[PDB]
Amino acid sequence: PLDTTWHRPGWTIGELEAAKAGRTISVVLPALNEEATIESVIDSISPLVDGLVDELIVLDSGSTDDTEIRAIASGARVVSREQALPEVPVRPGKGEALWRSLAATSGDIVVFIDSDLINPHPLFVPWLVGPLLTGEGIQLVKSFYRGRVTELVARPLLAALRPELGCVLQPLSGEYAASRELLTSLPFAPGYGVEIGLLIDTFDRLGLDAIAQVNLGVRAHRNRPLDELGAMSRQVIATLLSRCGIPDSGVGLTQFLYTRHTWPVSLVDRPPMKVMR
Amino acid sequence: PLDTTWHRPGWTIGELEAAKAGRTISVVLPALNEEATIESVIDSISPLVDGLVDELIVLDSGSTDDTEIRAIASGARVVSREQALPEVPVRPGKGEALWRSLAATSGDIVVFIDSDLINPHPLFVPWLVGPLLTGEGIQLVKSFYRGRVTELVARPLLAALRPELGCVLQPLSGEYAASRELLTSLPFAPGYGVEIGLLIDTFDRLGLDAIAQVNLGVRAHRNRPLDELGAMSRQVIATLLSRCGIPDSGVGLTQFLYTRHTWPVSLVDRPPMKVMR
Ligand SMILES: O=c1ccn([C@@H]2O[C@H](COP(=O)(O)OP(=O)(O)O)[C@@H](O)[C@H]2O)c(=O)[nH]1
Ligand SMILES: O=c1ccn([C@@H]2O[C@H](COP(=O)(O)OP(=O)(O)O)[C@@H](O)[C@H]2O)c(=O)[nH]1
């Protein structure tokens, strides 16, 4: 049903490069306070630059640590959200950063890799672009690998409301690649909703045959607090309900620490980047 | 908004007993393979029997361990699902057990306490019945206390679709009490959907003023596997969407262990026990 590559792809980098056929490739690393891991991520990919990869940027999303200086010292082009699109005031969240990154790149193909990876494989990018390069009509490639939000919230909600996407193992995965034509044609959900939004919109518009998923081997759970997962789940839900035509209250999740706190949720997507042309 | 008792209730057992005023109290312990903890739970409550508590049963939900013999050796009346209602074939899941327990009790008030508690407080039952006994119009009392499904799935979904219930700290809590009149008037969701179903139905029919929540002090996370949480979340979602008028696919969550497995979900509620009269 869904083109799934279960084992190590066999394509060599030179085959893949040859297969580009004039198409270009941009790589985007969104980054918010990832000073510990950003350089390792950049280094895993920079040997591809001027070859398979035509372009690499770090999309810095307001870091106040050493993310930017360290990315620069690893030879990466670093682009702030403001620089990506300076006529338009910056909103918080991941989705804003990824959407803005479209204005700061020009590749026919765009690859996203999270900047929080601990020793990422140097073949992530080649493995992700394979189906886009080699085939016809694949426009989106998702990764999978051996989380709580994914397995308790997103996958069960998909089974409930878009069971056709039940075969996708990591719908929330931060590692994926897509054609510019697709990406600039889709709205971008705010915050942590962006991946699930892109997947449902992609499916609704082109169906499964435009989607592939590739095995990246092994990944281990980021350690983050429960409360951040709470807010994340809320935004994933808001984005998922909206794509399925269901009205969301717009009310943020409240949590009680013995004290009460309400986290922000957003029901506002960014429009297709195409309108900004 | 929602009557919440944040500290230790001050009512003494003799006040509470006096406040019954001819009303009776049943206690139900649903149990599936809880041989390690069932006796401690029964013992925490049996000193109340023939006083505040008029009736205690263990609703045995198909145990194949020593649950039943150990409950009997602690002086509990043990009722199988079949015995609770023998003309009607037994379905799997928690909701079936709780629903059936209504036919095996006759208290004006029914208290549910999970049978998997590690050293439960002997005041759980007095604390839960307090608002039902002392006041007017409270028909349902939920507990709260210092889980993943609760905080990632149920609370965020309530915020999305029934934000009025956002102030409920433990919507999925297995410890609660209610009037028979209320309980026999509501359908019972299958599986792990039963608590969330009772809460939403209660709210929709009587509003918040009929609902209270009481502090039980401290509770610690049951250790159960992620996959069981996956199936649990799916059923909670199915029950929640249905109460909110949203169609659920009826498709079970699938998980990939490198091998694939699909877990059951049910879109079938039991009707109000009243129709069985
Ligand atoms: O407003 C944001 C939030 C996240 N990210 C980036 O998106 C990626 C995934 O975010 P996540 O919160 O999952 O990673 P974490 O913060 O736990 O390291 C990270 O590399 C972040 O640096 C970002 O650029 N802007
Ligand atoms: O089909 C079921 C499932 C659960 N329970 C009871 O409902 C309570 C809560 O179930 P849960 O799965 O949360 O507890 P666990 O199995 O982890 O001990 C337990 O005491 C169970 O014995 C039951 O009677 N029948």
Q: Per the structure block, which two tokens stand in for A190?
A: 């705010």
Distance A115 CA to ligand 2 centre (A): 41
Residue with tokens 């998923």: A213
Ligand index nearest the alpha carbon of residue A224: 1
Residue A184 sits in a domain of what CATH number?
3.90.550.10
How crowded is the C-beta side of B269, counted as CA atoms within 13 Å? Answer: 21
User: What are the two backbone dihedrals, phi and then psi, of residue A66, each rounded to the nearest 5 degrees?
Assistant: -90, 20
Judge whether A203 and A165 are in contact, CB under 8 Å: yes
Neighbours of A156 (CB within 10 A): 27
Name every residue whose Cβ is closer than 8 Å to that of residue B149 and which is 6 or more positions away in sequence: A152, B172, B229, B232, B233, B236
Residues of B with Cβ-Cβ distance to A265 under 8 angstroms: 159
- Angle between helical axes of A194-206 and A226-243 (0-180°, round to 10): 20
- Shortest-distance ligand to the CA of residue A222: 1
User: Judging by DSSP bridges, how do beta strands B77-80 and B25-31 pair with one another?
Assistant: unpaired
Binary contact (B230, A151; C-beta < 8 A): yes
CA R_g for chain A: 18
* Closest chain A C-alpha to B240 CA, distance in angstroms: 11
Query: This structure's resolution (angstroms)?
Result: 2.6
| Residue closest to B165 by CA, chosen among B122, B201, B217 | B201
Both structure tokens of A133: 């390069």
What is the count of structural domains for chain A? 1
| Both structure tokens of A55 | 């372009």
Own/partner long-range contacts of B160-163 (Cβ < 8 Å, ≥24 apart): B160/A234, B160/A237, B160/A238, B160/A241, B160/A248, B160/A249, B160/A251, B161/A241, B161/A246, B161/A248, B161/A249, B161/B240, B161/B244, B161/B246, B162/B200, B162/B203, B162/B244, B163/A249, B163/A251
**Phi, psi at B211, each rounded to 5°:** -115, 135
Residue of B117, B150, B123 lying closest to B214 (CA atoms): B123
> In 3D, which of B116, B118, B115 has the Cα closest to residue B101?
B115
The label of the residue with tokens 């200086």 reads A69
Q: Give the integer Cα–Cα distance in Å for A162 and A239.
A: 13
**Do A74 and A46 form a contact (C-beta atoms < 8 A)?**
yes
Alpha-carbon torsion, ordered A12, A15, A17, A20, to 10 deg = -130
Question: Tokens for A95?
Answer: 């989705």
The finding on whether B224 has its CB within 6 A of some atom of ligand 2 is yes
Q: A152 and B156 in contact by Cβ < 8 A? A: no
Instruction: Yes or no: say if B169 and B144 are a contact pair by the CB < 8 Å rule.
Output: yes
Tokens 């929709």 correspond to B204
H/E element holding A276?
Answer: none
Q: Are B71 and B31 in contact (CB under 8 A)?
A: yes
Residue B244: CA count within 13 A, CB half-sphere: 23
Triad A169, A175, A176: Cα angle to 5°: 85
Look up residue B2 and give its two tokens: 């929602």
Question: What residues 214-253 of chain A have any CB closer than 8 A to a CB of chain B?
Answer: 226, 229-230, 233-234, 237-238, 241, 246, 248-249, 251-253
Backbone angles phi, psi at A234, to 5 degrees: -55, -40
Enclosing domain of residue A239: 1-277
Give the pairing of strands A77-80 and A55-60.
parallel
* A159 part of contact set with chain B, CB < 8 Å: yes
End-to-end Cα distance, chain A? 35
* C-alpha count within 13 angstroms, C-beta hemisphere, residue A59: 28
- Report CA(B93)–ligand 2 centroid distance (Å): 8
The single residue listed with the structure tokens 């023939």 is B50
Q: Quote the CA–CA distance of A85 and B30 in Å, as a whole number.
A: 59
B222 is in an annotated binding site: yes
Tokens 């279960």 locate to A6
Single-letter amino acid code for the residue at A118: I
Strand partners, B30: B59
Flag if B156 and A230 touch (Cβ within 8 Å): yes
Give the H/E segment covering residue B40.
helix B38-45
If contacts are CB pairs under 8 Å, which of residues 53-92 in chain A contact chain B?
Answer: none
